Design a protein around this ligand. Structure first.
Ligand SMILES: Oc1cccc(-c2cccc(C3CCOCC3)n2)c1
Length: 858
């Protein structure tokens, strides 16, 4: 068909890789993934096209509820009907439900239009004006993020009554167009030769090889003989490992590291010993090596695609049987593991309960955990991860006994399942068990952990896996999940080790949602133009003055192709945000090294809410910033769930390509540095520089509004002081700290975290203290907020630990080792009691106060 060919070229363009490149590999694993996932995704699309209209609102506009609502007060609301300039302003309560508000608008419609209407409130949903956001369901208005936000900002909610027939037309418009255990011999390989090797001719070449199950060795590593440096080294030697073929676990990976010795690391290469169809591999393998920056078990098990430049290692996997050998089926494993013995002292049960509730163990402690594995399943099922780490993955009988217990193991909480996704648990049955326990994740929880789940994909041994199918199914059932899954994958297509896997997932996704593919192409077309616009700005800035470059940026944006590409798109930062008309006159660029673009938009339909900005940045890697901001947002969720609103500003930050991304503009905000410039002929010009922030807050908040802004400042300062301490955010100064006109303080530009002490600044203490030198009442109230926020985070310490552990897959320079995670373990003081950790925090807080006073003395 002409339409299939067009769809194929549109996917190719969108994902940044031609679909022809998949077919060219002539790889059956690739082929099977493509066919199986295309079928799975098209079935999701057909189920979606028949959804009921409210179910379709749930798919396309999932509810944005307050964290406190998850699991009184007077309010004015403006309500219009779709395709009508006319609106109605009425007084409702924060405790009222959307239905009462809709019944109220329909009664008004009936009186104004003089008709006794047939119209029932059950046939409508409320759209947030000029946003892809809807208010529906049995929730009081205050439970909706949009209404809650309006209440605190003092703004009036603007809502549109949309009929079921209009929602159904949206659904329709958006349719897809019409035996191993017998093999006792030791595992061995033949190391044949190397190709395209570059090293000092005075040195020698050695290949180190190890067998791994995740991070753990299956046996001691074996090294080759030292052979003279040359571009084509020849070994033709047998390397024998101390493990029987029968004992190779299903997820066994053979890892190689080529290096030069007089140590000069050259390259590395890994492979699974069983293929995707569970067949033990035999015959020759040409392994295109990755350059080393010595064994790398966590590294990808797929060869370097740069076959022209990559060093190659040629090996031979011997034919261990006259017929193909497959890893035993679950039925055979369960049959073998079924048999075992079960019987300890009451005093020993106390030692077991002690260690299973305690996390490194001594050999005798591991032996008691393994002996007592049945009691682990029956009375401590949440200690599965500990049992799994003591299992001898290099003994096929122990693995069968572990797997037998795993198959009757009760489902575990979401938190436990997050830990099981760690690279430390490489077994496919454990991986499948972790996903089974993660299926109960709500869309809000999934959204919060999506970044980490995408990183887990880089640890996967095969293309078709339970995690990919889970992520695809959830993405096809929730458009906002689909949106962020697409962007997390797309932003890494320039990385050769993930481009194949990520490309295949986005293709499969596009098969499941042809309409969303076009919505995403429109976003990619805007980003392409921003990149070209930024390129022009960067060059024009190096030659002429800012007013000239700004007028030329504006002239370029005014071109028909720019006006069209940059307008009428869903924001990549938030698909609920519509970026309607680009406001060229208000667009500019920043003076920092990369000259980031400052893009403003307006929307008549949304009114003041359609006034939104985006920052486009090309040249810096935005992944660490996004992680930092998502961890700050998680803190805000956890605080809100305990009734603590610290008035944080978790603005959007999204990498979209190679050193490319967007940052959400927080309007009505300025840097501490700009405020402290203490410029003349301004409202905030102070007698003392310490008065500058308070005078700025007083100018934006006259009379009675001042008290609320100081409170907003105090709460957010407490939230950011705790956030930066726990996350080890350093390099903090007046140009990367901002303040909203509301009084809310927030941080920007998180280039450094995890320590790569607690901080209190005098200018800020002055605001908290309402401009008084001595105000211990206000200061200690601020200290109370800090301690409460800190104690709440500590209680969820394991969630942060598990999420950061998954993030080690990302390849962030400040999150490479366990030493980086030590900062988190220490900042949260998880080894201590709540009393001891609070004692430690008070010492670090009191220290920051004495450090702050070295500025108060002046
Ligand atoms: O998270 C980052 C990373 C790098 C730069 C920035 C950055 C640079 C200028 C301005 C802003 C603010 C964003 C929120 O709205 C006000 C501007 N962020 C933020």
């Amino acid at each position: 068909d002409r339409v299939k060919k067009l769809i194929n070229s549109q996917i190719s363009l969108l994902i940044g890789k031609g679909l022809h490149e998949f077919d060219s590999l002539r790889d059956p694993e690739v082929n099977d993934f493509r066919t199986k996932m295309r079928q799975f995704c098209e079935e999701a699309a057909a189920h979606r096209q028949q959804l009921g209209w409210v179910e379709w609102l749930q798919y396309s506009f999932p509810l944005q509820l307050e964290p406190s609502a998850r699991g009184n007060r007077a309010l004015l609301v403006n309500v219009k009907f779709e395709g009508s300039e006319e609106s109605f302003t009425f007084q409702v309560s924060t405790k009222d439900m959307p239905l009462a508000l809709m019944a109220c608008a329909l009664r008004k419609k009936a009186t104004v239009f003089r008709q006794p209407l047939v119209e029932q409130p059950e046939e409508y949903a409320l759209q947030v004006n000029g946003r892809h956001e809807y208010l529906y369901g049995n929730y009081p208005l205050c439970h909706f993020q949009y209404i809650c936000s309006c209440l605190h900002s003092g703004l009036t909610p603007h809502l549109t009554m949309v009929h079921s027939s209009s929602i159904l037309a949206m659904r329709d418009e958006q349719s897809n167009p019409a035996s191993l255990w017998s093999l006792e011999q030791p595992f061995s390989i033949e190391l044949i030769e190397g190709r395209k090797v570059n090293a000092d001719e005075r040195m020698k070449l050695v290949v180190q090889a190890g067998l791994f199950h995740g991070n753990e060795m299956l046996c001691k590593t074996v090294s080759s003989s030292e052979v003279n440096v040359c571009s084509e080294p020849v070994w033709k030697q047998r390397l024998e490992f101390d493990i029987s073929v029968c004992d190779l676990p299903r997820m066994a990976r053979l890892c190689f590291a080529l290096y030069a010795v007089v140590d000069c690391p050259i390259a590395w290469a890994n492979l699974m010993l069983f293929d995707y169809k569970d067949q033990l591999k035999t015959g020759e393998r040409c392994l295109y090596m990755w350059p080393s920056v010595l064994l790398n078990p966590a590294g990808t098990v797929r060869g370097n695609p740069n076959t022209e430049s990559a060093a190659a290692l040629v090996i031979y996997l011997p034919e261990v049987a006259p017929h193909p050998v497959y890893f035993p089926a679950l039925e055979k494993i369960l049959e073998l593991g079924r048999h075992g013995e079960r019987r300890i002292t009451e005093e020993e049960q106390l030692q077991l309960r002690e260690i299973l509730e305690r996390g490194e163990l001594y050999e005798h402690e591991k032996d008691l955990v393994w002996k007592m594995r049945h009691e682990v399943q029956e009375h401590f099922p949440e200690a599965l991860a500990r049992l799994l780490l003591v299992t001898k993955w290099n003994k096929h009988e122990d693995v069968a006994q572990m797997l037998y217990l795993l198959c009757s193991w009760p489902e575990l909480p979401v938190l436990s399942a997050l830990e099981l996704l760690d690279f430390s648990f490489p077994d496919c049955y454990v991986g499948s068990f972790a996903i089974k326990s993660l299926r109960k994740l709500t869309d809000d929880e999934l959204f919060q952990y999506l970044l980490q789940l995408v990183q887990v994909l880089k640890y996967e041994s095969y293309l078709d896996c339970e995690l990919t199918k889970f992520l695809l199914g959830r993405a096809l059932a929730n458009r906002k999940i689909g949106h962020f899954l697409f962007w997390h994958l797309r932003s890494e297509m320039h990385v050769p080790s993930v481009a194949l896997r990520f490309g295949l997932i986005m293709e499969a996704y596009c098969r499941g949602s042809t309409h969303h593919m076009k919505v995403l192409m429109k976003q990619g077309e805007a980003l392409s133009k921003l990149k070209a616009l930024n390129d022009f700005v960067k060059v024009s800035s190096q030659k002429t003055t800012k007013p000239q470059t700004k007028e030329m940026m504006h002239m370029c944006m005014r071109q028909e192709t720019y006006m069209e590409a940059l307008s009428h798109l869903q924001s990549p930062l938030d698909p609920s945000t519509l970026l309607e008309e680009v406001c060229v006159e208000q667009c500019t660029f920043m003076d920092s090294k990369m000259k980031p673009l400052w893009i403003m938009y307006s929307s008549e339909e949304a009114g003041s809410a359609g006034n939104v900005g985006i920052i486009f940045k090309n040249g810096d890697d935005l992944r660490q910033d996004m992680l930092t901001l998502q961890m700050i947002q998680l803190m805000d969720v956890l605080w809100k769930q305990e009734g603590l609103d610290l008035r944080m500003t978790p603005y959007g930050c999204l990498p979209t390509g190679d050193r490319t991304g967007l940052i959400e503009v927080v309007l009505h905000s300025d840097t501490i540095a700009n405020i402290q410039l203490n410029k003349s002929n301004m409202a905030a010009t102070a007698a003392f520089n310490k008065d500058a922030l308070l005078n700025w807050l007083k100018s934006k908040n006259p009379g009675e509004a001042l008290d609320r802004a100081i409170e907003e400042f105090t709460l957010s300062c407490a939230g950011y002081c705790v956030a930066t301490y726990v996350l080890g955010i350093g390099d903090r100064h007046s140009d990367n700290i901002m303040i909203r006109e509301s009084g809310q303080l927030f941080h920007i530009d998180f280039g450094h975290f995890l320590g790569n002490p607690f901080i209190l600044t005098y200018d800020f203490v002055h605001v908290i203290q309402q401009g008084k030198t001595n105000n211990s009442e206000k200061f200690e109230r601020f200290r109370g907020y800090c301690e409460r926020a800190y104690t709440i985070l500590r209680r969820h310490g394991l969630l942060f630990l598990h999420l950061f552990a998954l993030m080690r897959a990302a390849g962030l320079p400040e999150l490479s080792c366990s030493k980086d995670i030590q900062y988190l373990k220490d900042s949260l003081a998880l080894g201590k009691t709540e009393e001891e950790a609070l004692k430690h925090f008070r010492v670090k807080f009191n220290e920051a106060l004495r450090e702050s006073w070295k500025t108060k003395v002046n």
